[PDB]
Amino acid sequence: VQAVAVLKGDAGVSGVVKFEQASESEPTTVSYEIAGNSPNAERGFHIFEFGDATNGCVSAGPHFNPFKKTHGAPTDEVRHVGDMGNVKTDENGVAKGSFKDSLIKLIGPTSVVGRSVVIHAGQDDLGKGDTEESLKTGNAGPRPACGVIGLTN
Protein backbone atom coordinates (compact mmCIF):
# COMPACT_ATOMS: atom_id res chain seq x y z
CA VAL A 1 0.00 0.00 0.00
CA GLN A 2 1.33 3.39 -1.06
CA ALA A 3 0.19 6.85 -0.03
CA VAL A 4 1.35 10.40 -0.71
CA ALA A 5 0.68 13.91 0.54
CA VAL A 6 1.40 17.12 -1.34
CA LEU A 7 2.37 20.06 0.88
CA LYS A 8 1.05 23.48 -0.20
CA GLY A 9 0.56 26.75 1.59
CA ASP A 10 0.71 30.49 1.04
CA ALA A 11 4.16 30.55 2.68
CA GLY A 12 6.51 29.64 -0.15
CA VAL A 13 7.12 26.28 1.47
CA SER A 14 6.01 23.22 -0.49
CA GLY A 15 6.83 19.58 -1.11
CA VAL A 16 5.78 15.95 -1.31
CA VAL A 17 5.69 13.11 1.23
CA LYS A 18 5.44 9.43 0.32
CA PHE A 19 4.38 6.40 2.39
CA GLU A 20 5.06 2.70 1.71
CA GLN A 21 3.76 -0.23 3.76
CA ALA A 22 3.54 -3.86 2.67
CA SER A 23 1.40 -5.18 5.56
CA GLU A 24 -0.31 -3.75 8.62
CA SER A 25 2.23 -5.40 10.93
CA GLU A 26 5.37 -4.35 9.07
CA PRO A 27 6.63 -0.76 9.47
CA THR A 28 5.66 2.13 7.18
CA THR A 29 8.45 3.82 5.27
CA VAL A 30 8.20 7.62 5.14
CA SER A 31 9.99 9.51 2.40
CA TYR A 32 10.01 13.29 1.99
CA GLU A 33 11.35 16.38 0.22
CA ILE A 34 10.37 19.94 1.10
CA ALA A 35 11.65 23.30 -0.20
CA GLY A 36 10.86 26.87 0.90
CA ASN A 37 11.98 26.18 4.48
CA SER A 38 14.43 28.35 6.44
CA PRO A 39 18.03 27.45 5.61
CA ASN A 40 20.04 25.16 7.92
CA ALA A 41 17.31 24.53 10.48
CA GLU A 42 14.97 21.95 12.04
CA ARG A 43 11.21 22.02 11.48
CA GLY A 44 8.44 20.10 13.25
CA PHE A 45 6.71 17.39 11.19
CA HIS A 46 3.39 16.02 12.43
CA ILE A 47 0.38 14.05 11.22
CA PHE A 48 -2.88 15.62 12.42
CA GLU A 49 -5.94 13.54 13.29
CA PHE A 50 -8.06 14.93 10.46
CA GLY A 51 -7.37 15.96 6.90
CA ASP A 52 -10.29 18.41 6.93
CA ALA A 53 -8.96 21.92 6.38
CA THR A 54 -12.36 23.54 5.91
CA ASN A 55 -11.22 25.65 8.86
CA GLY A 56 -7.47 25.29 8.84
CA CYS A 57 -5.47 24.04 11.79
CA VAL A 58 -8.69 23.94 13.85
CA SER A 59 -10.66 21.52 11.72
CA ALA A 60 -7.57 19.33 11.48
CA GLY A 61 -7.72 18.53 15.17
CA PRO A 62 -4.64 17.66 17.30
CA HIS A 63 -1.77 15.32 16.49
CA PHE A 64 -3.15 11.94 15.43
CA ASN A 65 -3.08 10.23 18.82
CA PRO A 66 -5.06 6.97 18.54
CA PHE A 67 -3.41 5.58 21.70
CA LYS A 68 -4.15 8.51 24.01
CA LYS A 69 -0.56 9.41 24.95
CA THR A 70 1.45 12.66 25.26
CA HIS A 71 3.66 14.47 22.73
CA GLY A 72 7.10 13.02 22.19
CA ALA A 73 9.94 12.24 19.81
CA PRO A 74 9.86 9.45 17.18
CA THR A 75 12.47 7.76 19.37
CA ASP A 76 10.48 7.87 22.64
CA GLU A 77 7.92 5.19 23.56
CA VAL A 78 5.36 7.71 24.74
CA ARG A 79 4.30 9.64 21.67
CA HIS A 80 1.33 10.47 19.44
CA VAL A 81 1.54 8.13 16.43
CA GLY A 82 1.65 11.26 14.33
CA ASP A 83 4.90 12.53 15.83
CA MET A 84 7.56 12.51 13.15
CA GLY A 85 9.79 14.90 15.06
CA ASN A 86 11.97 17.34 13.12
CA VAL A 87 13.28 17.37 9.57
CA LYS A 88 16.62 19.08 8.97
CA THR A 89 17.10 21.60 6.13
CA ASP A 90 20.23 22.32 4.06
CA GLU A 91 21.62 25.72 3.04
CA ASN A 92 18.85 26.01 0.46
CA GLY A 93 15.97 25.47 2.86
CA VAL A 94 15.37 22.03 1.42
CA ALA A 95 14.56 19.11 3.71
CA LYS A 96 15.15 15.75 2.08
CA GLY A 97 15.16 12.41 3.83
CA SER A 98 13.31 9.26 4.86
CA PHE A 99 12.76 6.98 7.85
CA LYS A 100 10.72 3.99 9.01
CA ASP A 101 8.14 3.98 11.76
CA SER A 102 6.25 1.20 13.45
CA LEU A 103 3.32 3.27 14.75
CA ILE A 104 2.42 5.05 11.51
CA LYS A 105 0.38 2.76 9.25
CA LEU A 106 -1.37 2.89 5.88
CA ILE A 107 -3.46 -0.12 6.92
CA GLY A 108 -5.90 -1.03 9.66
CA PRO A 109 -7.87 0.90 12.34
CA THR A 110 -5.00 3.37 12.78
CA SER A 111 -4.45 4.09 9.09
CA VAL A 112 -3.34 7.66 8.48
CA VAL A 113 -4.81 7.72 4.99
CA GLY A 114 -7.11 10.74 4.85
CA ARG A 115 -5.45 12.60 7.71
CA SER A 116 -3.15 15.55 7.08
CA VAL A 117 0.63 16.00 7.17
CA VAL A 118 2.03 19.35 8.27
CA ILE A 119 5.43 20.95 8.57
CA HIS A 120 5.84 23.81 11.00
CA ALA A 121 7.76 27.07 11.00
CA GLY A 122 9.59 26.13 14.17
CA GLN A 123 11.48 23.32 15.83
CA ASP A 124 9.53 20.62 17.69
CA ASP A 125 10.76 20.38 21.31
CA LEU A 126 9.84 16.69 21.24
CA GLY A 127 7.96 17.00 24.52
CA LYS A 128 11.25 17.40 26.39
CA GLY A 129 10.17 20.84 27.52
CA ASP A 130 8.62 22.19 30.70
CA THR A 131 5.09 23.31 29.90
CA GLU A 132 1.99 21.21 29.39
CA GLU A 133 2.19 22.83 25.97
CA SER A 134 5.38 20.91 25.22
CA LEU A 135 3.53 17.67 25.94
CA LYS A 136 0.79 18.64 23.48
CA THR A 137 2.17 20.28 20.31
CA GLY A 138 5.84 20.55 21.18
CA ASN A 139 5.99 24.27 20.41
CA ALA A 140 6.66 23.99 16.69
CA GLY A 141 4.70 27.21 16.26
CA PRO A 142 2.89 28.13 12.96
CA ARG A 143 2.46 25.60 10.14
CA PRO A 144 3.44 27.02 6.66
CA ALA A 145 2.27 24.08 4.55
CA CYS A 146 0.30 20.86 4.84
CA GLY A 147 -1.49 18.17 2.86
CA VAL A 148 -3.85 15.20 2.93
CA ILE A 149 -2.46 11.68 2.77
CA GLY A 150 -3.93 9.99 -0.27
CA LEU A 151 -3.79 6.55 -1.87
CA THR A 152 -1.55 6.20 -4.90
CA ASN A 153 0.82 4.25 -7.12
Binding site: V6, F50, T152
Partner: protein, 243 residues
Protein backbone atom coordinates in the same frame (compact mmCIF):
# COMPACT_ATOMS: atom_id res chain seq x y z
CA UNK B 1 -36.26 8.85 5.12
CA UNK B 2 -33.24 7.13 6.71
CA UNK B 3 -30.85 9.60 5.07
CA UNK B 4 -30.60 11.59 8.29
CA UNK B 5 -27.33 12.44 9.98
CA UNK B 6 -26.49 14.46 13.04
CA UNK B 7 -24.35 17.59 12.79
CA UNK B 8 -23.21 20.16 15.32
CA UNK B 9 -22.75 23.82 14.42
CA UNK B 10 -21.35 26.58 16.60
CA UNK B 11 -23.51 29.71 16.55
CA UNK B 12 -23.58 32.41 19.17
CA UNK B 13 -26.78 31.97 21.17
CA UNK B 14 -26.35 33.85 24.45
CA UNK B 15 -28.87 36.62 23.87
CA UNK B 16 -32.51 37.13 24.89
CA UNK B 17 -33.94 35.61 21.68
CA UNK B 18 -30.92 34.15 19.90
CA UNK B 19 -32.27 30.60 20.01
CA UNK B 20 -35.84 31.55 19.10
CA UNK B 21 -34.56 33.27 15.94
CA UNK B 22 -32.58 30.20 14.96
CA UNK B 23 -35.62 28.04 15.66
CA UNK B 24 -37.54 30.51 13.50
CA UNK B 25 -34.90 30.73 10.79
CA UNK B 26 -35.02 26.96 10.16
CA UNK B 27 -38.75 26.39 10.84
CA UNK B 28 -39.59 26.16 7.14
CA UNK B 29 -36.50 24.21 6.04
CA UNK B 30 -37.89 20.84 4.96
CA UNK B 31 -35.80 17.86 5.97
CA UNK B 32 -34.92 18.82 9.56
CA UNK B 33 -35.92 16.21 12.19
CA UNK B 34 -34.67 18.06 15.26
CA UNK B 35 -32.65 20.90 16.74
CA UNK B 36 -30.86 20.80 20.08
CA UNK B 37 -29.43 23.83 21.78
CA UNK B 38 -26.65 23.30 24.29
CA UNK B 39 -26.67 26.95 25.36
CA UNK B 40 -23.71 26.35 27.68
CA UNK B 41 -21.14 25.50 24.98
CA UNK B 42 -23.16 27.44 22.40
CA UNK B 43 -23.58 24.55 19.99
CA UNK B 44 -26.54 23.48 17.89
CA UNK B 45 -26.92 19.76 17.25
CA UNK B 46 -29.00 19.15 14.12
CA UNK B 47 -30.71 15.95 12.96
CA UNK B 48 -31.70 16.00 9.30
CA UNK B 49 -31.44 14.87 5.70
CA UNK B 50 -30.37 18.35 4.60
CA UNK B 51 -27.09 19.56 3.08
CA UNK B 52 -24.83 21.28 5.65
CA UNK B 53 -24.62 24.19 3.19
CA UNK B 54 -28.41 24.58 3.35
CA UNK B 55 -28.30 24.90 7.12
CA UNK B 56 -25.32 27.25 7.05
CA UNK B 57 -26.77 29.39 4.26
CA UNK B 58 -30.35 29.56 5.46
CA UNK B 59 -28.86 31.04 8.61
CA UNK B 60 -26.54 33.41 6.76
CA UNK B 61 -29.46 34.99 4.94
CA UNK B 62 -30.72 35.68 8.43
CA UNK B 63 -27.55 37.28 9.75
CA UNK B 64 -26.90 34.30 12.02
CA UNK B 65 -23.43 32.94 11.26
CA UNK B 66 -22.89 29.22 12.01
CA UNK B 67 -19.70 27.16 11.88
CA UNK B 68 -20.00 23.40 11.41
CA UNK B 69 -17.78 21.54 13.91
CA UNK B 70 -18.66 17.91 13.35
CA UNK B 71 -20.94 15.59 11.43
CA UNK B 72 -21.91 11.95 11.75
CA UNK B 73 -20.70 8.92 13.69
CA UNK B 74 -16.94 8.91 14.00
CA UNK B 75 -15.42 7.88 10.65
CA UNK B 76 -18.65 8.38 8.75
CA UNK B 77 -17.85 11.80 7.25
CA UNK B 78 -15.24 13.29 4.90
CA UNK B 79 -14.37 16.62 3.30
CA UNK B 80 -12.72 17.57 0.00
CA UNK B 81 -11.57 21.10 -0.76
CA UNK B 82 -11.50 21.60 -4.50
CA UNK B 83 -8.65 23.63 -5.93
CA UNK B 84 -7.30 24.14 -9.44
CA UNK B 85 -3.79 22.90 -10.15
CA UNK B 86 -2.78 25.43 -12.80
CA UNK B 87 -3.75 28.90 -13.89
CA UNK B 88 -6.07 29.43 -16.82
CA UNK B 89 -6.22 32.41 -19.14
CA UNK B 90 -9.79 32.92 -17.96
CA UNK B 91 -8.91 32.98 -14.25
CA UNK B 92 -8.02 36.25 -12.61
CA UNK B 93 -4.41 37.29 -12.06
CA UNK B 94 -4.58 37.68 -8.25
CA UNK B 95 -6.88 34.71 -7.44
CA UNK B 96 -6.05 31.82 -5.06
CA UNK B 97 -6.85 28.26 -6.14
CA UNK B 98 -9.97 27.25 -4.19
CA UNK B 99 -13.08 26.74 -6.32
CA UNK B 100 -15.33 24.45 -4.32
CA UNK B 101 -16.10 21.99 -1.58
CA UNK B 102 -17.42 18.45 -1.34
CA UNK B 103 -18.66 17.61 2.15
CA UNK B 104 -19.41 13.88 2.44
CA UNK B 105 -21.63 12.20 5.06
CA UNK B 106 -22.57 8.54 5.32
CA UNK B 107 -26.24 7.99 6.17
CA UNK B 108 -26.72 4.30 5.42
CA UNK B 109 -24.79 1.05 5.74
CA UNK B 110 -24.23 1.77 2.08
CA UNK B 111 -25.25 5.30 1.11
CA UNK B 112 -23.52 8.63 1.47
CA UNK B 113 -24.64 12.19 0.84
CA UNK B 114 -22.59 14.64 -1.19
CA UNK B 115 -23.01 18.36 -0.54
CA UNK B 116 -21.17 19.74 -3.55
CA UNK B 117 -20.62 23.49 -3.76
CA UNK B 118 -18.77 25.56 -6.36
CA UNK B 119 -18.38 29.28 -5.80
CA UNK B 120 -16.57 31.51 -8.26
CA UNK B 121 -15.82 29.67 -11.48
CA UNK B 122 -14.88 32.01 -14.35
CA UNK B 123 -16.75 30.08 -17.04
CA UNK B 124 -20.45 29.45 -16.47
CA UNK B 125 -21.83 26.07 -17.42
CA UNK B 126 -22.51 22.49 -16.30
CA UNK B 127 -19.64 20.88 -14.38
CA UNK B 128 -19.25 17.17 -13.65
CA UNK B 129 -18.19 15.58 -10.38
CA UNK B 130 -16.54 12.18 -10.15
CA UNK B 131 -14.23 10.38 -7.76
CA UNK B 132 -10.85 9.25 -9.08
CA UNK B 133 -8.75 6.22 -8.28
CA UNK B 134 -5.89 8.01 -6.46
CA UNK B 135 -5.57 10.81 -3.94
CA UNK B 136 -2.37 11.98 -5.56
CA UNK B 137 -2.56 15.60 -6.68
CA UNK B 138 1.15 15.93 -7.43
CA UNK B 139 0.46 16.42 -11.14
CA UNK B 140 -3.11 17.69 -10.95
CA UNK B 141 -5.91 15.52 -12.34
CA UNK B 142 -3.35 13.55 -14.32
CA UNK B 143 -1.72 11.93 -11.31
CA UNK B 144 -5.10 10.74 -10.01
CA UNK B 145 -5.52 7.76 -12.31
CA UNK B 146 -8.76 6.56 -13.88
CA UNK B 147 -12.30 7.29 -12.71
CA UNK B 148 -13.50 5.36 -9.69
CA UNK B 149 -17.09 6.58 -9.78
CA UNK B 150 -18.80 9.10 -12.01
CA UNK B 151 -21.76 11.04 -10.64
CA UNK B 152 -24.53 11.85 -13.09
CA UNK B 153 -26.33 14.86 -11.69
CA UNK B 154 -24.51 17.83 -13.17
CA UNK B 155 -23.41 20.80 -11.12
CA UNK B 156 -25.14 23.75 -12.73
CA UNK B 157 -22.95 26.82 -12.52
CA UNK B 158 -24.92 29.77 -13.77
CA UNK B 159 -25.76 31.65 -10.58
CA UNK B 160 -23.93 34.88 -9.84
CA UNK B 161 -20.98 34.59 -7.46
CA UNK B 162 -20.69 36.77 -4.37
CA UNK B 163 -16.98 36.89 -5.17
CA UNK B 164 -17.00 38.58 -8.55
CA UNK B 165 -19.69 40.49 -10.42
CA UNK B 166 -19.13 38.11 -13.36
CA UNK B 167 -18.04 34.87 -11.70
CA UNK B 168 -20.39 31.94 -11.22
CA UNK B 169 -21.41 29.39 -8.65
CA UNK B 170 -23.58 26.34 -8.19
CA UNK B 171 -24.49 23.53 -5.87
CA UNK B 172 -25.86 20.03 -6.05
CA UNK B 173 -26.92 17.54 -3.36
CA UNK B 174 -26.06 14.05 -4.68
CA UNK B 175 -26.33 10.62 -3.13
CA UNK B 176 -24.40 7.42 -3.91
CA UNK B 177 -24.07 3.84 -2.63
CA UNK B 178 -20.43 4.60 -1.82
CA UNK B 179 -19.42 3.98 1.79
CA UNK B 180 -17.07 6.49 3.44
CA UNK B 181 -14.33 3.93 3.99
CA UNK B 182 -13.75 3.49 0.27
CA UNK B 183 -13.88 7.23 -0.32
CA UNK B 184 -11.25 8.59 2.06
CA UNK B 185 -7.81 8.62 0.53
CA UNK B 186 -9.09 9.09 -2.99
CA UNK B 187 -9.75 12.27 -4.93
CA UNK B 188 -12.84 14.32 -5.71
CA UNK B 189 -12.73 16.03 -9.10
CA UNK B 190 -15.02 18.62 -10.65
CA UNK B 191 -14.30 19.62 -14.23
CA UNK B 192 -15.90 20.96 -17.39
CA UNK B 193 -14.62 20.97 -20.92
CA UNK B 194 -13.26 24.48 -21.64
CA UNK B 195 -15.30 26.37 -24.20
CA UNK B 196 -12.13 27.61 -25.92
CA UNK B 197 -9.23 25.20 -25.13
CA UNK B 198 -7.54 26.99 -28.05
CA UNK B 199 -6.76 29.99 -25.82
CA UNK B 200 -4.89 28.07 -23.13
CA UNK B 201 -1.10 28.13 -23.74
CA UNK B 202 -0.81 24.41 -23.04
CA UNK B 203 -2.33 21.08 -23.99
CA UNK B 204 -5.03 21.92 -21.40
CA UNK B 205 -8.50 20.66 -22.38
CA UNK B 206 -10.65 20.85 -19.23
CA UNK B 207 -11.04 23.44 -16.48
CA UNK B 208 -10.79 21.37 -13.32
CA UNK B 209 -10.41 21.63 -9.57
CA UNK B 210 -9.97 18.73 -7.19
CA UNK B 211 -8.71 17.67 -3.80
CA UNK B 212 -7.94 14.53 -1.80
CA UNK B 213 -10.93 13.18 0.16
CA UNK B 214 -9.96 13.79 3.80
CA UNK B 215 -11.31 12.62 7.14
CA UNK B 216 -13.64 15.02 8.89
CA UNK B 217 -14.35 14.98 12.62
CA UNK B 218 -17.64 13.40 13.53
CA UNK B 219 -20.19 15.01 15.81
CA UNK B 220 -18.61 15.78 19.22
CA UNK B 221 -15.37 14.18 18.03
CA UNK B 222 -13.10 17.25 17.82
CA UNK B 223 -12.86 20.06 20.35
CA UNK B 224 -9.77 21.87 19.11
CA UNK B 225 -10.43 25.59 19.51
CA UNK B 226 -7.23 27.52 18.81
CA UNK B 227 -3.76 26.68 17.57
CA UNK B 228 -0.08 27.61 17.85
CA UNK B 229 1.44 30.76 16.43
CA UNK B 230 4.06 33.38 17.33
CA UNK B 231 5.22 36.85 16.32
CA UNK B 232 3.13 40.03 16.55
CA UNK B 233 6.43 42.03 16.64
CA UNK B 234 6.34 45.79 16.24
CA UNK B 235 9.90 46.03 14.92
CA UNK B 236 9.06 43.30 12.43
CA UNK B 237 5.87 45.14 11.59
CA UNK B 238 7.75 48.34 10.86
CA UNK B 239 10.13 46.63 8.42
CA UNK B 240 7.12 45.41 6.48
CA UNK B 241 5.71 48.91 6.37
CA UNK B 242 8.96 50.23 4.91
CA UNK B 243 9.97 47.55 2.37
Amino acid sequence: TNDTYEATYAIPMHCENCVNDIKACLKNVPGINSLNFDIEQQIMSVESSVAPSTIINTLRNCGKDAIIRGAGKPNSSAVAILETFQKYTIDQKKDTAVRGLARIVQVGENKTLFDITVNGVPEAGNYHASIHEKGDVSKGVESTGKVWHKFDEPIECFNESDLGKNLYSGKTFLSAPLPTWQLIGRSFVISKSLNHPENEPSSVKDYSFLGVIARSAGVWENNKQVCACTGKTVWEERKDALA
